Amino acid sequence: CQFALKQPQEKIVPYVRQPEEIIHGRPLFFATAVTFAGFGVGLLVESHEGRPTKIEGNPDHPASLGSTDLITQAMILTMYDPDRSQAPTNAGQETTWDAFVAAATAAMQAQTAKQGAGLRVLSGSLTSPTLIAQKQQLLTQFPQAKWYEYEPVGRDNANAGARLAFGADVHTIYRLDTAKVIVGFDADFTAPSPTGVRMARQLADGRRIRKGTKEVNRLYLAESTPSITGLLADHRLPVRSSQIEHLVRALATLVGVPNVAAGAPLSDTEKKWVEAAAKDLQANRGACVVLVGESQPPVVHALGHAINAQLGNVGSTVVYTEPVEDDPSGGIAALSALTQEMNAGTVEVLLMIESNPVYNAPADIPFAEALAKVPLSMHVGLYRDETAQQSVWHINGAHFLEAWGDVRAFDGTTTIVQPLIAPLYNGKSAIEVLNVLLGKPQETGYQTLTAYWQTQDASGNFRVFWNTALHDGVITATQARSRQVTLQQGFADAAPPAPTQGLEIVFRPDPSLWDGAFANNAWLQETPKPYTKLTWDNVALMSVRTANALGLKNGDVVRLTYQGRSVDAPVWVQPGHADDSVTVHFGFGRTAAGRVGNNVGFNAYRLRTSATPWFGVGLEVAKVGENYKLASTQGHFLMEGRKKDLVRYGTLAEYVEDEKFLQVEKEEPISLIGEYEYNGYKWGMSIDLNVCNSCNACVVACQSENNIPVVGKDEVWLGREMHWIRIDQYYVGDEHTPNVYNMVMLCQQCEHAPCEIVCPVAATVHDAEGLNNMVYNRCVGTKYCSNNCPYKVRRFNFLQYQDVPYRSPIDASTENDSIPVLKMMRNPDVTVRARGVMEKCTFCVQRINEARIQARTENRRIADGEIMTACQQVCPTQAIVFGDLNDPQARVVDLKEQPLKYTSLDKLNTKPRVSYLAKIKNLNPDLAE
Amino acid sequence: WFKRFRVSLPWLFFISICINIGMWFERWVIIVLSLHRDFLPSSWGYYTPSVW
Numbered sequence: 001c002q003f004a005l006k007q008p009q010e011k012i013v014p015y016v017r018q019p020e021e022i023i024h025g026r027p028l029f030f031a032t033a034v035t036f037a038g039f040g041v042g043l044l045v046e047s048h049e050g051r052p053t054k055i056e057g058n059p060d061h062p063a064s065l066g067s068t069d070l071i072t073q074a075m076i077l078t079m080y081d082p083d084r085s086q087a088p089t090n091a092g093q094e095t096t097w098d099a100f101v102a103a104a105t106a107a108m109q110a111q112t113a114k115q116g117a118g119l120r121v122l123s124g125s126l127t128s129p130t131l132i133a134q135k136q137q138l139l140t141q142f143p144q145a146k147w148y149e150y151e152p153v154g155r156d157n158a159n160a161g162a163r164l165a166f167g168a169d170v171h172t173i174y175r176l177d178t179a180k181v182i183v184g185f186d187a188d189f190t191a192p193s194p195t196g197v198r199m200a201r202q203l204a205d206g207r208r209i210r211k212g213t214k215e216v217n218r219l220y221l222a223e224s225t226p227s228i229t230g231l232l233a234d235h236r237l238p239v240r241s242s243q244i245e246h247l248v249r250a251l252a253t254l255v256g257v258p259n260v261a262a263g264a265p266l267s268d269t270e271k272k273w274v275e276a277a278a279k280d281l282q283a284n285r286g287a288c289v290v291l292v293g294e295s296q297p298p299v300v301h302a303l304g305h306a307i308n309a310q311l312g313n314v315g316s317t318v319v320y321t322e323p324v325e326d327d328p329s330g331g332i333a334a335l336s337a338l339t340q341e342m343n344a345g346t347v348e349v350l351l352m353i354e355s356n357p358v359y360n361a362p363a364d365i366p367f368a369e370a371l372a373k374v375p376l377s378m379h380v381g382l383y384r385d386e387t388a389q390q391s392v393w394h395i396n397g398a399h400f401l402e403a404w405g406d407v408r409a410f411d412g413t414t415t416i417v418q419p420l421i422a423p424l425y426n427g428k429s430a431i432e433v434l435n436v437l438l439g440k441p442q443e444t445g446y447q448t449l450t451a452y453w454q455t456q457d458a459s460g461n462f463r464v465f466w467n468t469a470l471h472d473g474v475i476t477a478t479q480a481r482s483r484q485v486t487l488q489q490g491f492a493d494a495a496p497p498a499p500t501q502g503l504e505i506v507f508r509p510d511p512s513l514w515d516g517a518f519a520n521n522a523w524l525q526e527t528p529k530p531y532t533k534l535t536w537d538n539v540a541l542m543s544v545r546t547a548n549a550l551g552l553k554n555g556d557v558v559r560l561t562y563q564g565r566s567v568d569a570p571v572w573v574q575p576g577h578a579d580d581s582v583t584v585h586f587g588f589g590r591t592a593a594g595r596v597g598n599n600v601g602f603n604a605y606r607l608r609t610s611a612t613p614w615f616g617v618g619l620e621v622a623k624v625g626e627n628y629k630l631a632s633t634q635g636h637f638l639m640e641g642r643k644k645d646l647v648r649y650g651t652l653a654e655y656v657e658d659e660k661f662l663q664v665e666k667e668e669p670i671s672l673i674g675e676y677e678y679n680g681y682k683w684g685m686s687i688d689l690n691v692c693n694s695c696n697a698c699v700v701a702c703q704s705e706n707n708i709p710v711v712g713k714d715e716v717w718l719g720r721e722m723h724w725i726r727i728d729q730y731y732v733g734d735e736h737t738p739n740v741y742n743m744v745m746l747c748q749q750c751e752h753a754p755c756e757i758v759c760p761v762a763a764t765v766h767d768a769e770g771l772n773n774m775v776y777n778r779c780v781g782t783k784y785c786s787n788n789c790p791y792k793v794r795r796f797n798f799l800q801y802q803d804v805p806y807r808s809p810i811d812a813s814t815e816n817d818s819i820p821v822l823k824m825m826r827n828p829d830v831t832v833r834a835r836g837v838m839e840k841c842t843f844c845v846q847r848i849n850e851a852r853i854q855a856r857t858e859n860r861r862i863a864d865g866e867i868m869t870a871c872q873q874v875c876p877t878q879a880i881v882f883g884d885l886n887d888p889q890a891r892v893v894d895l896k897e898q899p900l901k902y903t904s905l906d907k908l909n910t911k912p913r914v915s916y917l918a919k920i921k922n923l924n925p926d927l928a929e
Numbered sequence: 930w931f932k933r934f935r936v937s938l939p940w941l942f943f944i945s946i947c948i949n950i951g952m953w954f955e956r957w958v959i960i961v962l963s964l965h966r967d968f969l970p971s972s973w974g975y976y977t978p979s980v981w
């Protein structure tokens with residue numbers, strides 16, 4: 001409770017030397033990129049005045065055509081995270097940077113007498129050209145040094161299955177522009193994977209249902225765990241994940257591949273799925289693809305190319321190129337190769353750059369105890385991870401918005417990582433750290449970055465290239481060229497083993513938290529996991545069949561014992577899941593993540609094996625718990641007969657025969673309450689639920705943009721999550737194998753808004769532009785408006801929801817004290833709500849006002865693509881489309897005329913301003929029934 | 930209805946206890962039992978009342 005007769009004397013500090021580019025009060029977007037798995041995503045970040053505020057996709061980048069990921073969106077909080085490392089630590093004791101260079105260059109001179117024998121490095125699957133080129137200088141200045149690449153989720157099998165089927169290593173580039181039939185076994189390709197944004201848009205661009213569409217992608221998915229690809233999957237099949245490895249062997253025998261030698265008979269329903277898929281891939285041969293996820297063994301990815309090249313997809317859909325990353329022979333096998341070298345004391349200088357393997361170890365590779373058997377073990381990470389607890393040195397991280405580096409996306413399009421801000425704490429990124437090891441410490445990151453690109457630029461001048469490389473970000477001059485392949489057969493000649501019986505633990509990365517490197521990110525943790533709306537919890541998902549067998553509920557706490565190691569995990573029954581198998585999420589139980597992901601339980605990394613690192617059939621469940629919180633946001637996961645108001649579904653079998661087959665013909669509803677005219681801009685939105693794969697990137701995009709506060713798990717279980725936009729899974733019918741549909745629910749900006757007539761002080765009123773205006777300051781916290789809101793979109797700041805993972809909201813001694821590091825990630829044109837103030841999806845008025853005012857200043861009108869809401873230009877699939885409804889040539893008023901257009905709860909005349917499109921899901925004739 | 934249970938004050942005091950509690954549950958049925966399960970099944974809460 002703050003009170004004063006006068007607000008304090010707010011100061012106005014100008015610059016000391018204002019840059020020629022900073023106009024105070026204007027976004028000034030930059031062009032950088034983010035190493036997700038070594039591959040770039042090509043960002044375009046809002047740099048208000050030196051500091052970044054909001055991360056957006058660079059529309060010129062191939063890995064993100066203007067829309068970002070879920071992790072990639074919330075990585076503006078990972079930077080403005082008060083738990084980020086602020087100074088190097090020598091043996092736990094905080095120390096200076098120049099003290100590290102004194103003891104790092106002294107180790108190089110001790111690693112020079114010996115010909116660089118103990119200078120092992122544990123970076124994680126880097127594709128950066130300037131980091132590769134400094135890896136080259138480090139391995140020739142020290143010839144015996146080795147560089148082990150270990151990413152816990154990266155292409156360990158797909159890169160070892162590419163050279164298992166082709167000889168040398170290749171880097172496949174799947175293209176879904178021309179792909180009528182996708183059959184991706186365990187393929188979570190619309191996932192946080194490096195190609196996840198493009199493979200979500202190129203797959204959505206095939207299922208753009210319009211007034212006259214007749215051909216749509218099919219996407220047969222075959223996956224044990226329900227995933228964000230299974231939403232767009234039209235025939236998803238819950239498989240054990242031990243049958244996938246011989247479910248592709250069955251498809252590679254229907255399609256004619258010579259020596260597959262399939263085995264382990266499939267099923268009555270898994271076989272009917274593999275005949276209908278193969279009979280669908282033999283048709284439209286040139287326009288099809290057979291994807292394979294990462295969980296599968298390398299012999300399956302070898303068959304993924306044995307079928308793709310058999311259907312003639314090479315050169316058309318699947319394109320093999322030079323490997324973008326430096327060495328694809330690293331990963332689980334390179335981590336064990338180094339750990340066996342850290343044992344017996346061969347390693348003397350171990351620079352673990354960003355891998356964090358003390359946490360990410362498969363629990364068979366004993367990296368935790370192999371560490372400290374070395375004399376000097378460095379680390380350069382933005383968080384003091386579980387390695388920094390055990391390593392000697394720990395250099396600060398220099399998060400990618402503060403580091404002068406580069407990336408190389410898929411297909412090789414390098415993007416110069418562009419530091420928006422100078423590092424909040426002295427950064428010393430992976431390039432500024434190898435400069436210490438190479439012997440050039442005082443040479444900054446930007447100096448080596450151009451000292452490498454001046455060599456790689458032979459065409460024309462440099463400042464006409466370097467600044468053009470910095471402006472677009474995309475250099476697109478190092479495009480990974482194609483490579484002729486051979487597909488040497490006989491790789492599947494080895495017979496499949498005897499099928500093992502027992503419950504199977506399938507290891508999966510968490511959609512939101514990929515591999516635990518972002519566990520302290522409160523935004524992508526509060527964000528509900530896609531199918532199970534849990535927020536702050538890692539669970540053991542089971543199908544309803546394989547939990548009624550064990551007598552398990554949605555709240556018990558089982559003890560997953562897989563090959564001797566027990567984990568004591570919760571349980572959450574997931575209807576779409578597969579029989580006799582559980583899944584796990586990678587990256588939750590972190591002893592030293594920070595203050596956010598510090599004790600979110602169930603570290604699933606301590607159950608792997610490094611021989612069965614993605615799925616294994618030796619699990620014993622044996623429940624040892626009774627009750628757990630398991631804060632999930634949704635509540636009821638069933639369409640309780642309320643179709644026509646929730647996500648309406650159909651099929652293309654009955655859409656070509658009747659376009660308006662789910663648009664109910666209703667007369668003009670009588671409305672006593674007047675009628676207002678909006679002759680200005682009529683701001684409306686048209687969501688296409690056919691392509692909403694629950695990526696949850698729009699959930700974080702509304703958090704990064706609208707200063708939405710994180711809530712603790714203790715208050716999300718109470719149903720007090722602040723999320724102006726939410727995606728709703730609904731699980732229609734047949735709880736063993738249910739179809740799942742999304743209706744992304746936000747504030748419909750109702751013209752006859754019932755939530756407005758019910759505010760006593762008249763806080764929430766409508767607009768002359770046509771959108772419900774929530775006024776956070778006139779809100780006295782009556783909270784009645786939500787009770788009148790039919791959709792329950794309005795969220796209420798019950799307690800002082802602000803910096804909540806860093807200060808528990810149930811206190812009030814610090815509720816007026818704000819974290820100074822967090823005050824920068826907040827949008828400078830959205831109100832940071834106090835407690836007792838309701839909020840809702842305001843169509844991003846912070847973007848409508850700043851653009852209308854720029855239009856009225858210039859005496860012109862708003863262009864159709866000028867006002868993109870935060871959730872519209874972040875959705876990879878481009879489901880959300882926002883724009884003027886009065887502008888007749890707009891992509892919304894030409895999108896609200898589709899035969900699938902409907903509004904939620906039209907039985908009560910709210911005149912919702914968002915109008916969802918139905919989910920037409922292209923069922924096969926000979927596979928449905 | 931019956932004067933046997935109205936003139937007898939121990940019954941009129943027990944029925945009044947049963948109404949004050951009963952007419953509190955009417956205000957719970959009207960408010961919470963109708964709010965926690967409404968339109969949009971993805972917005973179904975429970976409201977276990979806290980100690981405060």
Ligand code: SF4
Pocket residue numbers: 691692693694695696697698699727744871874875876877878879880
């Ligand atoms: S609408 Fe939301 S859930 Fe759907 S694709 Fe876009 S960001 Fe993802």
Ligand code: SF4
Pocket residue numbers: 746747748749750753754755756772788789790791792793794840910
């Ligand atoms: S949809 Fe809900 S929040 Fe939006 S105007 Fe209508 S009642 Fe208000």
Ligand code: SF4
Pocket residue numbers: 698701702703705706724725746747840841842843844869870871872
């Ligand atoms: S328009 Fe902006 S504020 Fe509204 S729900 Fe979408 S992302 Fe959130």
Ligand code: F3S
Pocket residue numbers: 758759760761762763764778779780781782783784785786837838
């Ligand atoms: S009804 Fe009225 S004053 Fe505040 S939270 Fe709800 S608006």
